[PDB]
Scaffold this active site. Structure first.
Site, PDB file in Angstrom:
ATOM      1  N   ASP A 212     -12.674  26.532  -9.939  1.00 42.16           N
ATOM      2  CA  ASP A 212     -12.699  27.944 -10.356  1.00 42.16           C
ATOM      3  C   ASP A 212     -14.018  28.640 -10.055  1.00 42.16           C
ATOM      4  O   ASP A 212     -15.014  28.427 -10.761  1.00 42.16           O
ATOM      5  CB  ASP A 212     -12.422  28.038 -11.858  1.00 42.16           C
ATOM      6  CG  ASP A 212     -12.119  29.458 -12.290  1.00 42.16           C
ATOM      7  OD1 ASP A 212     -13.002  30.108 -12.846  1.00 42.16           O
ATOM      8  OD2 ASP A 212     -10.990  29.914 -12.056  1.00 42.16           O
TER       9      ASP A 212
ATOM     10  N   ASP B 105     -12.706  34.798  -6.379  1.00 40.54           N
ATOM     11  CA  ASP B 105     -12.292  33.902  -7.458  1.00 40.54           C
ATOM     12  C   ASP B 105     -11.140  33.005  -7.035  1.00 40.54           C
ATOM     13  O   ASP B 105      -9.995  33.440  -6.995  1.00 40.54           O
ATOM     14  CB  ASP B 105     -11.945  34.713  -8.720  1.00 40.54           C
ATOM     15  CG  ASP B 105     -11.522  33.830  -9.912  1.00 40.54           C
ATOM     16  OD1 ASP B 105     -11.677  32.593  -9.844  1.00 40.54           O
ATOM     17  OD2 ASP B 105     -11.012  34.392 -10.915  1.00 40.54           O
TER      18      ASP B 105
HETATM   19  C1  LIG Z   1      -4.749  30.548 -10.207  1.00 40.68           C
HETATM   20  C2  LIG Z   1      -4.524  30.923 -11.674  1.00 40.68           C
HETATM   21  C3  LIG Z   1      -4.500  29.689 -12.594  1.00 40.68           C
HETATM   22  C4  LIG Z   1      -5.840  29.115 -13.069  1.00 40.68           C
HETATM   23  C5  LIG Z   1      -6.496  29.892 -14.206  1.00 40.68           C
HETATM   24  C6  LIG Z   1      -5.727  30.283 -15.429  1.00 40.68           C
HETATM   25  C7  LIG Z   1      -6.333  30.955 -16.404  1.00 40.68           C
HETATM   26  C8  LIG Z   1      -7.780  31.317 -16.288  1.00 40.68           C
HETATM   27  C9  LIG Z   1      -8.478  30.968 -15.211  1.00 40.68           C
HETATM   28  C10 LIG Z   1      -7.779  30.217 -14.127  1.00 40.68           C
HETATM   29  C11 LIG Z   1      -9.941  31.308 -15.086  1.00 40.68           C
HETATM   30  C12 LIG Z   1     -10.310  32.528 -14.247  1.00 40.68           C
HETATM   31  C13 LIG Z   1     -11.803  32.848 -14.435  1.00 40.68           C
HETATM   32  N1  LIG Z   1     -10.092  32.277 -12.790  1.00 40.68           N
HETATM   33  C14 LIG Z   1      -9.486  33.701 -14.708  1.00 40.68           C
HETATM   34  O1  LIG Z   1      -9.734  34.273 -15.757  1.00 40.68           O
HETATM   35  O2  LIG Z   1      -8.451  33.944 -13.874  1.00 40.68           O
HETATM   36  C15 LIG Z   1      -7.584  35.075 -14.159  1.00 40.68           C
HETATM   37  C16 LIG Z   1      -6.157  34.998 -13.662  1.00 40.68           C
HETATM   38  C17 LIG Z   1      -5.328  33.754 -13.604  1.00 40.68           C
HETATM   39  C18 LIG Z   1      -4.066  33.823 -13.160  1.00 40.68           C
HETATM   40  N2  LIG Z   1      -3.486  34.987 -12.760  1.00 40.68           N
HETATM   41  C19 LIG Z   1      -4.183  36.073 -12.787  1.00 40.68           C
HETATM   42  N3  LIG Z   1      -3.623  37.258 -12.421  1.00 40.68           N
HETATM   43  C20 LIG Z   1      -3.163  38.129 -13.512  1.00 40.68           C
HETATM   44  S1  LIG Z   1      -2.897  37.407 -10.900  1.00 40.68           S
HETATM   45  C21 LIG Z   1      -1.249  36.952 -11.103  1.00 40.68           C
HETATM   46  O3  LIG Z   1      -2.929  39.025 -10.490  1.00 40.68           O
HETATM   47  O4  LIG Z   1      -3.587  36.329  -9.839  1.00 40.68           O
HETATM   48  C22 LIG Z   1      -5.583  36.128 -13.273  1.00 40.68           C
HETATM   49  C23 LIG Z   1      -3.176  32.593 -13.092  1.00 40.68           C
HETATM   50  C24 LIG Z   1      -3.243  31.758 -11.823  1.00 40.68           C
END
Ligand SMILES: C[C@@H]1CCc2cccc(c2)C[C@@](C)(N)C(=O)OCc2cc(nc(N(C)S(C)(=O)=O)c2)CC1
Length: 365
Positions: free
Chosen positions: A36, A218
């Site tokens: 991460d 990220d």
């Molecule tokens: C690979 C991710 C899984 C690992 C994961 C889960 C939860 C937190 C993190 C990392 C830490 C950090 C710091 N990376 C964090 O806070 O990311 C925001 C995030 C995650 C995710 N989706 C997000 N979005 C809402 S989207 C769908 O637009 O890409 C944002 C989930 C997919």
């Protein structure tokens, strides 16, 4: 290549995260750890959880030292609470070193772990400024560099599993030249986007909008996330350029999926997106070009896709679907991030140089 043992040390995918094996404690406890670049805490599941195959058992580690302090970490998505301590940590398919690192033992969590993702903890590779509880809790990579001679650099090839090369650059993992953009500030991996094009057509927004209130790289975010004003303009432009076919409006909002007969996805009808990044020389920029294969994310005889560009209220996030095109070098030692075409009718590209004036004016102050 001298870094061959680190090649293919990652597993996972954009939608659920990429992870590396890390070995903690004595005797060894090996766990799968999310890579991460959007956070700075090293933390591992340390108690049973429905979504965890294994967890860290501190009582079994003779080298574990409890710091007798708790920590709470809220992310963009999810949160966890746990106990701070230190233990010995190595990366079996990474550098040949062992370091004593801060480790948070996660005892409770909400909407953090993901069913079927196969990871049990998180390796925050960003800087101390954004560590919890505060910047005095040395991040893992800082400990690595302080305690060993491993060069202050890592690179990620996300496919596209993938590779995390620690302490150098593996030339087998990319083609063409590496192009570097400055790290604006050492907190997140903050960069400056200076121009955006959809099929070669400039989006024509003031560049300050692209970086309000920051732009970051990220690996732990799936999508390209954009500030609302930019998202709106980009979607309007992408919609117009892909008019060969009509899509429901909710598709562009991620509220609907579209599926095609396996092998029939009409990639050719969707535009390429170019993000111009500030270069290393005055008035010089370069561009990375993103294919529909990147921004349409696969979710029988049908292939279902989700639009992987979405809205953010906390600035631009260049997530995994952006990185999947590229070999990305986090050159901490020289405060810069490099992009090259990854070894994993159109191709993703990294091109330059371009002349872009007043690039300094693009950053939020
Ligand atoms: C690979 C991710 C899984 C690992 C994961 C889960 C939860 C937190 C993190 C990392 C830490 C950090 C710091 N990376 C964090 O806070 O990311 C925001 C995030 C995650 C995710 N989706 C997000 N979005 C809402 S989207 C769908 O637009 O890409 C944002 C989930 C997919």
């Amino acid at each position: 290549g001298s870094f061959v043992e680190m090649v293919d040390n990652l597993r996972g995918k954009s939608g659920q995260g990429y992870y590396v094996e890390m070995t903690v404690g004595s005797p060894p406890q090996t766990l799968n750890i999310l890579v991460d670049t959007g956070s700075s805490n090293f933390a591992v599941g340390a108690a049973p959880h429905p979504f965890l195959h294994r967890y860290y058992q501190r009582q079994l580690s003779s080298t574990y030292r409890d710091l007798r302090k708790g920590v709470y970490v809220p992310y963009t998505q999810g949160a966890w609470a746990g106990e701070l301590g230190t233990d010995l940590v190595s990366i079996p398919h990474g550098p040949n070193v062992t370091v004593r690192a801060n480790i948070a033992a996660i005892t409770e969590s909400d909407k953090f772990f993901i069913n079927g993702s196969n990871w049990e903890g998180i390796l925050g590779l960003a800087y101390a400024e954004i560590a919890r509880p505060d910047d005095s809790l040395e991040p893992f990579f800082d400990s690595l560099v302080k305690q060993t001679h491993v060069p202050n650099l890592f690179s990620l090839q996300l496919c596209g599993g993938g590779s995390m090369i620690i302490g150098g650059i593996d030339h087998s993992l990319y083609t063409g030249s590496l192009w570097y953009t400055p790290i604006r500030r050492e907190w997140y991996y903050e960069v400056i986007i200076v121009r955006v094009e959809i099929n070669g057509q400039d989006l024509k927004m003031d560049c300050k909008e692209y970086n309000y209130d920051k732009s970051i790289v990220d690996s732990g975010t799936t999508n390209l996330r954009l500030p609302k004003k930019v998202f709106e303009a980009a979607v309007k432009s992408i919609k117009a350029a892909s008019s060969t076919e009509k899509f429901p409006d909710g598709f562009w909002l991620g509220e609907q999926l579209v599926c095609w007969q396996a092998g029939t996805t009409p990639w050719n009808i969707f535009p390429v997106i170019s993000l111009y990044l500030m270069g290393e020389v005055t008035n010089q920029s370069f561009r990375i070009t993103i294919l529909p294969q990147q921004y349409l994310r696969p979710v029988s005889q049908d292939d279902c896709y989700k639009f992987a560009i979405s809205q953010s209220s906390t600035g631009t996030v260049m997530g995994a679907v952006i990185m999947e095109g590229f070999y990305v070098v986090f050159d901490r030692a020289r405060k810069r991030i490099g992009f090259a075409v990854s070894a994993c009718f159109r191709t993703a590209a990294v091109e330059g140089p371009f002349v872009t004036l007043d690039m300094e004016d693009c950053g939020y102050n």
